């Protein structure tokens, strides 16, 4: 069901964007190992930073895992999922640290969590 005709171009493009960003980060990990971070270009470091923030943001706390972690679960609607991943890839959140994205749930909660860290 993942083709433009059924999911809409917005969704299809957000999904392919996330795939592209991760697939390039896989390339970059083994340069970063041998040469260290500083030899990357400015957009390569920005791609790495967005790819890590996306990889973190795909995590989520479940109302049924609430017994294992303790942390209360979150439900994320599809609108908010697309708006979050598109906003991250467009760089609207390049000013938040990576840990702010982990396990928050929705993207506004990322923006909130970044304050206290």
């Amino acid at each position: 069901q993942l083709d433009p005709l059924v999911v809409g171009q917005e969704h299809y493009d957000t999904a392919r964007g996330v795939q592209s960003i991760l697939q390039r980060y896989q390339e970059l990990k083994d340069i970063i190992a041998i040469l260290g971070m500083d030899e990357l270009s400015e957009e390569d470091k920005l791609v790495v930073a967005r790819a890590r923030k996306i990889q973190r943001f795909l995590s989520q706390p479940f109302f049924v895992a609430e017994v294992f972690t303790g942390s209360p679960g979150k439900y994320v609607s599809l609108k908010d999922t697309i708006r979050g991943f598109k906003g991250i890839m467009e760089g609207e959140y390049d000013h938040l640290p990576e840990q702010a994205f982990y396990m928050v749930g929705s993207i506004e909660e990322a923006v909130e969590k970044a304050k206290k860290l």
Partner: peptide
């Protein structure tokens, strides 16, 4: 300092893995 040879870096990384 690290050398700048990104191609040797990638080749050697793929080889090691």
């Amino acid at each position: 300092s690290s050398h700048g040879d990104v191609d040797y870096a990638q080749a050697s990384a793929e080889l090691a893995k």
